[PDB]
RNA sequence: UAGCGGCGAGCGAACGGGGAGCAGCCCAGAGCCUGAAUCAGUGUGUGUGUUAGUGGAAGCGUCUGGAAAGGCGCGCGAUACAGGGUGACAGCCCCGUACACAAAAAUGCACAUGCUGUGAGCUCGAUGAGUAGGGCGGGACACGUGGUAUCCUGUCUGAAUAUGGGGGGACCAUCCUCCAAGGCUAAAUACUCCUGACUGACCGAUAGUGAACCAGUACCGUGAGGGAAAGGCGAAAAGAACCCCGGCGAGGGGAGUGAAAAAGAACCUGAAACCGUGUACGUACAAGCAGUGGGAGCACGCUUAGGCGUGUGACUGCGUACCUUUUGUAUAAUGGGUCAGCGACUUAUAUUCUGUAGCAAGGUUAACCGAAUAGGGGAGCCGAAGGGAAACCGAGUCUUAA
RNA sequence: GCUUGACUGCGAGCGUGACGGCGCGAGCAGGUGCGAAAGCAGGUCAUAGUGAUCCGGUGGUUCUGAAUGGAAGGGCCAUCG
């Protein structure tokens, strides 16, 4: 193991393309840009979504819906996250302390995702009917 | 696993995951390369056609003169013109995952004990900060090119090694991947190896 | 990391100019003209490695035709006679025999005339 | 600098589960009196972006 | 992201979180106590800088060579093997370097102290009006007048005044929160004409500053302004005494110096185009991209009877340059007089995919801290759940009375 | 003659388009007309009679509502320029 004996992994350091360096390179004299036109020019090319003048897709379709400001303060909690909490009893504060939900989360819902093994006391959280059964099946307790 | 000391002739137990794992050359190579990149200063620059001192005046009119059309005396085609893609001061430092860095040290340390390039002693010190003493001590151990790693950095040992070219001392926390590879032998005190294990989990 | 091109550029210009030794005028002196002359010379050489095989066979056939008519038979009937006699001597050898050994060539004509008759 | 989303596209395409995009149908803003109820009914539900147009949408919504 | 936006191109927050840094005060007024905190000015002393400096270790022999610092041998110093120079590459020749010291005088910063000015503390009062707000016209807020809060004001108006007023994004009620129309305030931040030290996977004379050189010069322009070219003898000038040709020239030949003068100042190396002298061969009856295949003869090197190599090339088959652009070019379409040097897919940040490496239902930190590539820092970001415009529900959900 | 199927929600499966789209459609649910009944009817023998998006209007709406209750505005459904 010397400084002049270390070698990178096979196929991890592919060489980059070098355009316009002769015929043998396969990329000479045009750099793979074709012959003429807008796309062959330096800085050439059309912007995103441009379709040649036809009404682009994101303009011929209607806008729909609105953004809910309550969805930004609502999170979902998996069953597998109930064991990461400290103390057993879970609420908004204990989930935030465990870095499970964001600091600005005001509403939290436990869903049937993952699996819970220890008795957990859920307090002040909405629980799906599937997760409610799984929590009670592990000796847990749900209180509003 | 046991690391036999050179003088006390007693074994020293160490974690097998730290000193007895396989050598991941691809992993070590990336960390060694990234360490060299971190040493780069990257202080350089050239002048584009915008920074070259000169006038924006058109050297001659567009048509009629019979010469190739020109627009600026600073053009990169011209002598004394700018550089087409003039360099800027850049930062060559790469990111190394914490686990990839620590994973490379374990692969290097485990490789050293496999090459018998790692020597473990109970203690290593000199009385006065005199390079003559340290040079004599290493000759007794048949060592010329060696990296010495101690638990606490002693000033006398540090001063005595400053002028020795093929020798350098290092704290237990100051080890780096390229130093462990660059030197022929690596001498670690029993205190240093203990501190290295805590560093590498 | 600036790279000056002087050393390697002169090396490859000399490599071309060395292959152009003996060409007339600028074709052996200046690189732009010598390079075209060397490429054209390579094209001709590739083409003529195929033409050489045609020109020599054409020469052998002509010599065989001459020597055969000295014995009273044309090249056409002579070749057809040899195939009917199961002789598989090629034209490079027949033309060689026709020049350096007349009596052996006459013996071949007798063999060819027998297979025809 | 970060890529900027085409905000007009963000108000018209929603990313679905398997990476596709849903969108509202056209032809349902005005002039419905002359349109057959069957035609208008089939335009109410959201539709998926066709395979030929996914390249345009993905380019416009890099963070979707 | 939320938003703004011919809802186009584009523009683009805040709340909140993590860090660096952290400092609070005065007037709109009397009184009591009083000159008490504090700051400034101005001295003094102490400390630490800065402006000259001082000391600073340790090697010889032999070989090659013009020259030793190189080779070989045997020593020595090192808190000094940074660096530079010295007749080739020096730890020990020199200058330095590590380290240890040094100021008559001026001066920075601290401290302490004196002087001068400055006023602390307490009680009781007071609480910024053509102002807030409004109409009209503009502007600023990410926010283009929109349902448009908030801020500024050119114009016209115009309150309440703590039993009061402002804000919480039209607006109202409730609640919460703050007190405008008077000021001051260090640090964390931005920058480098300039000074010193140090560093470079920066340049090395067409590069790097325009300028390595007496360069913003020569030169150009009425002027503003524009703006070059141009580095290298040798270790040391030891820069060629003297002689000869020549015009008491230029230039040259000797001599001499030197390791070298084919290093002679038009001076290291000395390429190519281009121009010559000499030799070998060809060439004055022969038609064209000038080569290529075949090939005699001649010259020469051989070996040697090897019958090979090299140069030339009578004669002969075939054969209309290159690039670009084109359906298509010998084209009489474009471009190139030639040579030498330079001259064009980069960089940064995002994003996606592939490869590869680490870890894996987890992965990873950012700023920042840190004798700092370590370690700390998990603020965050992505992923493990989706459906719906949304409330919401959730391995389902939406659609619908179903 | 009698009538309002020129129905509401859907829709197996196809046709035709680069796409935006356009077209055909048995059957299912709800409710209805004609017929004694089997049945037929989601406009007209078929193929032309048309205009994306934005912006805005009108009606509805067990959606949203920037401290909270409302509202404004927005969304969704129907429809207009
Ligand atoms: Mg093209
Ligand atoms: Mg072109
Ligand atoms: Mg074209
Ligand atoms: Mg967090
Ligand atoms: Mg330049
Ligand atoms: Mg780190
Ligand atoms: Mg053939
Ligand atoms: Mg509508
Ligand atoms: Mg001295
Ligand atoms: Mg000394
Ligand atoms: Mg409000
Ligand atoms: Mg409070
Ligand atoms: Mg220059
Ligand atoms: Mg040069
Ligand atoms: Mg200039
Ligand atoms: Mg210049
Ligand atoms: Mg003279
Ligand atoms: Mg010279
Ligand atoms: Mg003749
Ligand atoms: Mg011909
Ligand atoms: Mg043309
Ligand atoms: Mg073509
Ligand atoms: Mg044409
Ligand atoms: Mg042709
Ligand atoms: Mg031409
Ligand atoms: Mg011509
Ligand atoms: Mg022309
Ligand atoms: Mg021309
Ligand atoms: Mg029915
Ligand atoms: Mg009936
Ligand atoms: Mg009809
Ligand atoms: Mg509200």
Curated annotation (Swiss-Prot), chain A:
PROSITE patterns: RIBOSOMAL_L15 (PS00475)
Keywords per UniProt: Ribonucleoprotein, Ribosomal protein, RNA-binding, rRNA-binding
Biased composition (Gly residues): 21-31
Biological process, per Gene Ontology: cytoplasmic translation
This protein's GO CC annotations: cytoplasm; cytosolic large ribosomal subunit
Gene Ontology terms for molecular function: rRNA binding; structural constituent of ribosome
Pfam annotation, one family: Ribosomal_L27A
Residue numbers spanned by region Disordered: 1-54
InterPro entries: Ribosomal_uL15, Ribosomal_uL15/eL18, Ribosomal_uL15/eL18_sf, Ribosomal_uL15_bac-type, Ribosomal_uL15_CS
Tree of life domain: Bacteria
Main function: This protein binds the 5S rRNA. It is required for the late stages of subunit assembly, and is essential for 5S rRNA assembly onto the ribosome.
PANTHER family: 50S RIBOSOMAL PROTEIN L15, LARGE RIBOSOMAL SUBUNIT PROTEIN UL15M
Subunit-structure text: Part of the 50S ribosomal subunit. Contacts the 5S rRNA.
Record-stated family: Belongs to the universal ribosomal protein uL15 family.
Name of the protein in question: Large ribosomal subunit protein uL15
Organism lineage string: Bacteria, Pseudomonadati, Pseudomonadota, Gammaproteobacteria, Enterobacterales
UniProtKB/Swiss-Prot annotation, chain B:
Database matches in InterPro entries: Ribosomal_uL4, Ribosomal_uL4-like, Ribosomal_uL4_dom_sf
Effect listed in the UniProt record for changing residue 63 to E: In strain: N282; confers erythromycin resistance. Ribosomes bind erythromycin poorly and have reduced peptidyltransferase activity
Entry keywords, A to Z: Antibiotic resistance, Repressor, Ribonucleoprotein, Ribosomal protein, RNA-binding, rRNA-binding, Transcription, Transcription regulation, Transcription termination, Translation regulation
GO molecular function, one term: RNA-binding transcription regulator activity
GO BP terms, alphabetized: cytoplasmic translation; DNA-templated transcription termination; negative regulation of cytoplasmic translation; negative regulation of DNA-templated transcription; negative regulation of translation; response to antibiotic; ribosome assembly; transcriptional attenuation
Domain of life, source organism: Bacteria
Region (Disordered): 44-71
GO terms for cellular component: cytoplasm; cytosol; cytosolic large ribosomal subunit; large ribosomal subunit
Self-association state and partner proteins as the record states: Part of the 50S ribosomal subunit. In TnaC-stalled ribosomes forms part of the binding pocket for L-Trp with the leader peptide and uL22.
Function: One of the primary rRNA binding proteins, this protein initially binds near the 5'-end of the 23S rRNA. It is important during the early stages of 50S assembly. It makes multiple contacts with different domains of the 23S rRNA in the assembled 50S subunit and ribosome.
Family as reported in the entry's similarity comment: Belongs to the universal ribosomal protein uL4 family.
UniProtKB/Swiss-Prot annotation, chain C:
Keyword Ribosomal protein listed: yes
GO biological process, one term: cytoplasmic translation
Pfam families to which the protein is assigned, alphabetical: Ribosomal_L20 (PF00453)
Signal peptide positions (record): none
Keywords: Ribonucleoprotein, Ribosomal protein, RNA-binding, rRNA-binding
Regions crossing the membrane: none
Family named by the database record: Belongs to the bacterial ribosomal protein bL20 family.
PANTHER family per the UniProt record, alphabetical: 39S RIBOSOMAL PROTEIN L20 (PTHR10986)
UniProt subunit comment: Part of the 50S ribosomal subunit. Contacts L21.
Protein name: Large ribosomal subunit protein bL20
Swiss-Prot record, chain D:
A Pfam family: Ribosomal_L35p
Protein's UniProt keywords contain RNA-binding: no
Signal sequence coordinates: none
Keyword presence, Ribosomal protein: yes
GO molecular function ontology, one term from the record: structural constituent of ribosome
Keyword terms, alphabetized: Ribonucleoprotein, Ribosomal protein
Gene3D superfamilies: 4.10.410.60
TM stretches of this protein: none
Highest taxon listed in the record's lineage: Bacteria
CC annotations in GO: cytoplasm; cytosolic large ribosomal subunit
Annotated region (Disordered), positions in chain: 1-21
GO biological process: cytoplasmic translation
Biased composition (Basic residues): 9-21
Family: Belongs to the bacterial ribosomal protein bL35 family.
Quaternary structure and interacting proteins, as annotated: Part of the 50S ribosomal subunit.
Name of the protein described by the UniProt record: Large ribosomal subunit protein bL35
Originating organism: Escherichia coli (strain K12)
Classification lineage: Bacteria, Pseudomonadati, Pseudomonadota, Gammaproteobacteria, Enterobacterales
